[PDB]
Design a protein around this ligand. Structure first.
Ligand code: NAP
Ligand code: HBI
Ligand code: CA
Length: 186
């Protein structure tokens, strides 16, 4: 594919999950940002694709699956068929990537977003392809059991601004966070 996008929200310890869910209670505005970013295509007639791991898939309440308006791909080495509601099952990112470029999809897909978890982010970060990482930094610590992998600051440069991403510190429910965009160029 031409370029990847990854989106994640992380707390001060780099935690992204806890017991199958997020480490913090619901943040409405942060979640709508994720929805807007992943859902918005810049081409009429195309939709974005979201790739995620098996635990992330199952972390979404059943009635809310598949994430509306996007093509859902789940990654799994153990499953045989796409879980009920997902559009495609792939055995590795490479395969999800090759699927995307296939004839039937290529013409249907605008952006590719990586939505986690850990091993998915890591794999995508390592591909020698152009990539933008949209990070929400939550300026607090929450107990976590799942963490975001280390980003190579020599490769991923923090942008000082980017179209449609607020620059100031945000606050909601007594919590502060900031949006950051890192860009890797090959
Ligand atoms: N804060 C956030 O932005 C954010 C984003 C996503 C998730 N989360 C949280 O993180 C947790 C889910 O994360 P996780 O890291 O534990 O799980 P995951 O990445 O969602 O799921 C792991 C399963 O995914 C499959 N898989 C993962 N990477 C693979 C690859 N490269 N190729 C093939 N299959 C691969 C494997 O399934 P098989 O074992 O079947 O092979 C692996 O066991 C939940 O707590 C969720 O709430 C938070
Ligand atoms: C897709 C499922 O919601 C998953 O937990 C994700 N959550 C978030 C995300 N990205 C942000 N910014 N916020 C979330 O809450 N990426 C993935
Ligand atoms: Ca497993």
């Amino acid at each position: 594919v031409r370029s990847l996008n990854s989106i994640v929200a992380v707390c001060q310890n780099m935690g992204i999950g806890k017991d199958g869910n997020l480490p913090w209670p619901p943040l409405r505005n942060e979640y709508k940002y994720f929805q807007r970013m992943t859902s918005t295509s810049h081409v009429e007639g195309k939709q974005n694709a979201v790739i995620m791991g098996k635990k992330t898939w199952f972390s979404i309440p059943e009635k809310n699956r598949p994430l509306k308006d996007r093509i859902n791909i789940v990654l799994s080495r153990e499953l045989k068929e796409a879980p009920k509601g997902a559009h495609y099952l792939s055995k590795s990112l490479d395969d999800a990537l090759a699927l995307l470029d296939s004839p039937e999809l290529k013409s249907k897909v605008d952006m590719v977003w990586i939505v986690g978890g850990t091993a998915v982010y890591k794999a995508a970060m390592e591909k020698p392809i152009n990539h933008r990482l949209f990070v929400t930094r939550i300026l607090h610590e929450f107990e976590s059991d799942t963490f975001f992998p280390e980003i190579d600051y020599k490769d991923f440069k923090l942008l000082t601004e980017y179209p449609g991403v607020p620059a100031d510190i945000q606050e909601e429910d007594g919590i502060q966070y900031k949006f950051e965009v890192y860009q890797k160029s090959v």
